[model samples]
Target: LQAACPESWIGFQRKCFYFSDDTKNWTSSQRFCDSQDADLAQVESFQELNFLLRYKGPSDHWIGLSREQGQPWKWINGTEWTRQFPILGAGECAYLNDKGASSARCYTERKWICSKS
Candidate 1:
């Protein structure tokens, strides 16, 4: 059967995405996704990354990827990031910007992307 996303969500391939209406810290952002039965948006390909970067407008949006100080980046699902896109800046939380996936302090408030299958 074809997967149908919620009417307010953006359907992409087999996933449904929601952009945040408010800004929050990375932790709180994930909590919001959890409430929606989703998680922070996980970009699995260049195409997906491209779509997110373009669709996201000028504001920053948190992603599912994060890392410890000096540790390898990992997605919320527990998979390690394979360096699919350039992760710049310095922090445990990752976000989307004109420069691709950039890191920022986890406590900084920002919009976020949520995804569900």
Candidate 2:
């Protein structure tokens, strides 16, 4: 899929990338990406993170990284934040598209970052 879809960006671990131009809630975005053979985008490496930072255009967007669970936050890809680039606070999983971190759930009408391998 990545080879066939050259225009589509590639992310860590051979993951294919896509961004929904439309707006949707965080949970809804997760469902939408899942329906399309992908999940909310999760950054693994510094390069991938920078790529996403650029993809946000001029504004912030919602990424799949979130701490919906009670434990420490994690990217949807399940990569631990051991190296610590964008340090997240406790119980915060969702990452802003470009702004880094945010915890607002009412801010739903925003773009999405999704990925699949």
Candidate 3:
């Protein structure tokens, strides 16, 4: 078998993903990803979104999508959300669930996923 990323990271397509075992708020989650030189997971395509939906477990986990009060949703890297994937619920911070992506208050504690190219 070949390894596309560091041990424990799951490599898919051209990107590498990491699922955290610990929980944190949305902001803290992004900071943890930044500490790893990565960012919270950003869904770039339907396939990518599908991958995340299928791979994540029962826990709701923080993702890279969020917005300020009255602002459009954006990825943590500062890219506009193109609405390629579904975002359920109404809130400022997004998280991943077995069903799909959703949002809630930023301070809600949850696990998170990190991604790097």
Candidate 4:
């Protein structure tokens, strides 16, 4: 964990956190999370979503959600978001509350968090 994104570290829900200091496009952030033992954080419930929202900085950061393939959005971790936790729009990916929901390239540097299995 320390080996990747050693500068930023946070902890939540029994998971270690690492915010990508450099802004990376959504895809790049996903790849970075994958390189670790995790993918972009998937908000399973409102509790988790709230937890993430608390840490949101000045700019929104990427998460595991994406619908670049189609209107149906899916988590990079392969988890499904149910109607109980429906997404806001047709946005292809998920992001932290930095600048609200804005589209970013995969390589653009930004803050991000990670979880472990």
Best by TM-score: 1
Name the runs in model 2 displaced over 4 angstroms. Answer: 1-13, 68-70, 77-80, 87-93, 97-101
- Which candidate would rank higher by TM-score, 1 or 2? 1
Instruction: Compose the digit string of candidate 2's lDDT tens values, residues 71-92.
Output: 6666666765555465454434
State residue 11's C-alpha deviation in candidate 3, in Å: 0.6
What stretches of model 3 exceed 4 Å from their correct place? 1-3
In model 1, the clashing pairs are none
- Considering summed lDDT, which 10 consecutive residues are worst modelled in model 1? 1-10
- Candidate 2: pairs in clash: 65-93, 65-94, 66-93, 66-94, 67-93
Task: Give the alpha carbon lDDT tens digit for every residue of 1-117 in model 1.
Answer: 435888678878878889887899999999999999999998888888888888887899999988999999999999999877688898899999875888999999999999999
- Ordered list by lDDT, greatest first: 1, 3, 2, 4
Off by over 4 Å in 1: 1-3
Taking every candidate in turn, the Cα RMSD to the unseen true structure, in Å, is: 1.5, 3.6, 1.8, 4.6
| TM-score of candidate 2 against the unseen true structure | 0.71
lDDT of each model, Cα atoms only? 0.89, 0.65, 0.87, 0.63
Off by over 4 Å in 4: 1-8, 84-86, 98-110
Candidate 3 lDDT over 17-77, as tens digits, reads 9999999998899899898888999778888888877888889988899998789999876
